[PDB]
Nucleic acid binder design. Sequence first.
RNA 1: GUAAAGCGCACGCAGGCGGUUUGUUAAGUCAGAUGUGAAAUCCCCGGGCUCAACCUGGGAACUGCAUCUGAUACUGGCAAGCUUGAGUCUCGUAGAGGGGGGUAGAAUUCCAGGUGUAGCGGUGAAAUGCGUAGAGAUCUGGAGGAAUACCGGUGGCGAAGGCGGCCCCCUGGACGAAGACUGACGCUCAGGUGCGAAAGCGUGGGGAGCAAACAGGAUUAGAUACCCUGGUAGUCCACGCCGUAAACGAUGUCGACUUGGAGGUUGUGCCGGCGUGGCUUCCGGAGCUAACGCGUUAAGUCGACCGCCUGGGGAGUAC
Lengths: 224, 88, 129
Amino acid sequence: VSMRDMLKAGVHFGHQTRYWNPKMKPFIFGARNKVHIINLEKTVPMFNEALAELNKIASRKGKILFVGTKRAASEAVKDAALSCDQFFVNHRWLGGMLTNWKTVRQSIKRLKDLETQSQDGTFDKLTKKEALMRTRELEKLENSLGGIKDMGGLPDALFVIDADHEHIAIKEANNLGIPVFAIVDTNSDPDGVDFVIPGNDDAIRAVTLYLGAVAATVREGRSQ
Amino acid sequence: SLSTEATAKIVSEFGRDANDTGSTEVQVALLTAQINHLQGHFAEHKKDHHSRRGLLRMVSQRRKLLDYLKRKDVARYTQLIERLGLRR
Amino acid sequence: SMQDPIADMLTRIRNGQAANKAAVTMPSSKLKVAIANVLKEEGFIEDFKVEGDTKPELELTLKYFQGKAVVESIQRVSRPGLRIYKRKDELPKVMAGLGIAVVSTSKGVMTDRAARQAGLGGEIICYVA
RNA sequence: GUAAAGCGCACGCAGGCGGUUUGUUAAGUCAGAUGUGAAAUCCCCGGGCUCAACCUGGGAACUGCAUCUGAUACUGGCAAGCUUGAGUCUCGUAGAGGGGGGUAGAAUUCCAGGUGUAGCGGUGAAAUGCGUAGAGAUCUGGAGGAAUACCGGUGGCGAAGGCGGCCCCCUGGACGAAGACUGACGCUCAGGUGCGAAAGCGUGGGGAGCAAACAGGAUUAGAUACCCUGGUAGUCCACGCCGUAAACGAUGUCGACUUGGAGGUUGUGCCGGCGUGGCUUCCGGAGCUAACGCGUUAAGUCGACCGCCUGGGGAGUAC
Ligand SMILES: [Mg+2]
Ligand SMILES: [Mg+2]
Ligand SMILES: [Mg+2]
Ligand SMILES: [Mg+2]
Ligand SMILES: [Mg+2]
Ligand SMILES: [Mg+2]
Ligand SMILES: [Mg+2]
Ligand SMILES: [Mg+2]
Ligand SMILES: [Mg+2]
Ligand SMILES: [Mg+2]
Ligand SMILES: [Mg+2]
Ligand SMILES: [Mg+2]
Ligand SMILES: [Mg+2]
Ligand SMILES: [Mg+2]
Ligand SMILES: [Mg+2]
Ligand SMILES: [Mg+2]
Ligand SMILES: [Mg+2]
Ligand SMILES: [Mg+2]
Ligand SMILES: [Mg+2]
Ligand SMILES: [Mg+2]
Ligand SMILES: [Mg+2]
């Protein structure tokens, strides 16, 4: 991760100046054709520091929740997490997933209670009505809690994409004292964010770049 | 208000130069000229209250400038009020 | 109209600190410079400087410790509408001695502790904590 | 702001307050000293009554006042400055700002006449009313008063109250760009003075439309109303008085400071873009707030000065 690849992936394209959060000012570089340019000359140490704090976190029995439901990320944020044996949430964050873990944990208890029935055959015993229902309950709990079935508990770090869209997940992290690493764009607040990577968080290439960097870093941390 | 010519004439007469538009004597003489002129307007237009507010502002500013001049240099003050025919 | 430049300087410090400004600037005066010198040598501001010949401007570098402004409270005491003088026995303690009172004595502007050590009273300019 | 509470608005004397530099003074202020501040009392330390209360020896204290001698940062006085506050000048700009005079077109009403004939008008439905003595409708001509469609706009101007066709005369303020000038001339303001919607009052005019009062027709249990048909003060003009309104942003004036976004309006600089001023609408951040909300036009953070409040009623009444 160094400057040139960030320009290639368009990390420096922010939102239009009129949608800016004045608190992003310290990472803003310009306002071209009325859109904000992010100062990548800070996206780096910042990001590189975020990547080292993660490692330190991972390399030590680490549990990093990736968070990215913005539909130009869901698929993208699953594989990066999947590539490093970490957990993910890429379809709507359920209010309380962390703060209300004791209740949410019961619905993953339902996911395995029922997924293990898609194989055990139990369905070969229904009026086609109740088994084609328990399946809607599967593909539903698989859609939201699919990537945190194995977390078996609260994490040691979130790597959220779009602090604005994922404002619920961060307030939850903050409330519980789990550090937050996030891509904060020029329209977002970095306040509850512990590691701010000022950068684009809606371009597919930039998000892929961040996710690849984080997943490689976590793989290194676990391997070491 | 005062025309360019009448203003410039007063500035030349009371000022220490044609550029000295800001001295207290020049300001007081300009105000006095406009007040005396407007006497004819308000003799005819007695119900022109809105303009008369500006006239009373002229009177008040002139009073303040005269008090400043009297406290600053009494001889200049006396000369000025004799030239313009002011009571005080 | 402006009738208390010292309260203005204190307010500029307070507001700049609240706004997380790195520095504040105001028109200068020798009294403001003396107060700023007390503030700097007591550790409440990083530094100050005066620039300009005919219209000097005083710039104060503010300081922050751990995301918090160092000047927690700064308050005018003696003011044009009510002057406050204290004899040396009655010099105020600010925050039980953890803050300072800035005192104009006949030996110059100094902290309440320095005035107490010099055995002088004077005008209580402000409380800084 | 909404709980009680910002004068309707302003000018302004007394008063309070006062940008910046140097010198001087030493009044305030500060330091020391001297005199005094009765004793008792209070307080601290002891001492006496078996203890205590009581009594009592020394201290402290009596925060004050005066005088003398020092200090000079701040405040005040005085002297000289300075230009950043305040003001003058030059050139332009927008504006329902004010006063006076004139004038235009639309419409209502009335009057005269032409055509024409049985209705019109009105309501929830009616009726009163108007109409064969020819209404209503329609056309022509005339008189008179009042108001200015469209433009027109969370547009503009004004201290507030307010201000709207067009033209002229007289006149106030605001703002912008370059400079030049004066050199703190400032801010606020009890009392005072001035302005101050509508209604009302006096005198003299005017009177189309509208309309308190009043009359009739309805409605209703009643209907001193709401609805209808009429209709006088008044509404209009001149001059004088009155001095009050939910005169409201229910938010006093002046200055400084403190993240943003979208507009309106009015200047100006440079090359439709980028700046830079004035006024203004909406949203919102910190902060503030009982909350609602306010939020660079603050109800945020401060300073100067003024006005005002102190449970509800009695009462903004009585005298
Ligand atoms: Mg009420
Ligand atoms: Mg009230
Ligand atoms: Mg008011
Ligand atoms: Mg005033
Ligand atoms: Mg001064
Ligand atoms: Mg003395
Ligand atoms: Mg005694
Ligand atoms: Mg004993
Ligand atoms: Mg004793
Ligand atoms: Mg002095
Ligand atoms: Mg009064
Ligand atoms: Mg009237
Ligand atoms: Mg009358
Ligand atoms: Mg009539
Ligand atoms: Mg009627
Ligand atoms: Mg009243
Ligand atoms: Mg009104
Ligand atoms: Mg209003
Ligand atoms: Mg009121
Ligand atoms: Mg708001
Ligand atoms: Mg009464």
